[PDB]
């Protein structure tokens, strides 16, 4: 598969901004992607050295716009720690 | 539709019956056209960011397409619309005279 299919988009939050000081980068990834694929994808695309990938699943949130109820998409979030001697990613 | 954006048309019905004007925009899905100077409405716009002041804006509202007819190039009278093939291209023609509208 393509590396750029694995990584969907960066998570830009206050939490994720705090993680970037610790050299940790939060990505929304493909829901099927294991953490080895995420590790390989980050190293391929950005040309960095990954220390470890922690990964978590988020359920879809129940949502409403007027009468119609429904769910947001489920998400897979990867927190990618780069090694000490590594180039930073440019978000 | 029998008319399009750019055509000079006469309004044949409504309050603005008799008034000529250019079609500023066409709405094929609704069968409506916006004719310049025709069917003016006074919109009461609140202060937005896009429109900062607000106020009562005089603007054209669409009329139904069947209430306009294109002008005959010869006489200047209203005409029904036919079609002929000229140089391969289809063109609208004034049924009154014969000449090409577009």
């Amino acid at each position: 598969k393509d590396p750029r299919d694995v990584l969907k988009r960066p998570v830009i939050t206050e939490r994720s901004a705090d993680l970037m000081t610790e050299k940790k980068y939060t990505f929304e990834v493909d829901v099927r992607a294991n953490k080895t694929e995420v590790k390989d994808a980050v190293e391929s695309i950005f040309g960095v050295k990954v220390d470890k990938v922690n990964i978590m699943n988020y359920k879809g949130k129940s949502k409403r716009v007027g009468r119609y109820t429904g769910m947001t998409s489920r998400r897979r979030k990867a927190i990618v720690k780069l090694t000490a001697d590594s180039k930073e990613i440019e978000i | 539709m029998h008319v399009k954006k750019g055509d000079k048309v006469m309004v044949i019905s409504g309050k603005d019956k008799g008034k000529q004007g250019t079609i500023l925009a066409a709405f094929p899905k609704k069968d409506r056209v916006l004719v310049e100077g025709v069917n003016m409405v006074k919109k009461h716009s609140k202060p937005t960011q896009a429109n900062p002041q607000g106020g009562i804006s005089n603007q054209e509202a669409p009329i139904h397409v069947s209430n306009v007819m294109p002008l005959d190039p010869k006489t200047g009278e209203v005409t029904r619309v036919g079609y002929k093939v000229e140089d391969g291209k289809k063109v609208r023609v004034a049924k009154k005279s014969g000449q090409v509208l577009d």
Partner: protein, 65 residues
């Protein structure tokens, strides 16, 4: 890029432009996430360009078989 222009390219040349477009599409999605992307219409354009090139590749595989 149109299908007539894509058919002039070789299969290896098309596949390279697919890779180039998928690099562009990735960067656009990142710019969209950060809120730096002005030209949002480009995402749809690149997606359909990828679709067009993959369509041409598959036509050649079917033509080969």
């Amino acid at each position: 890029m149109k299908a007539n222009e894509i058919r002039d390219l070789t299969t290896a040349e098309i596949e390279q432009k697919v890779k180039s477009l998928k690099e562009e599409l990735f960067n656009l999605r990142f710019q969209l996430a950060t809120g730096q992307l002005e030209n949002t219409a480009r995402i749809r354009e690149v997606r359909k360009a990828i679709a067009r090139m993959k369509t041409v590749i598959r036509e050649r595989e079917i033509a080969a078989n």
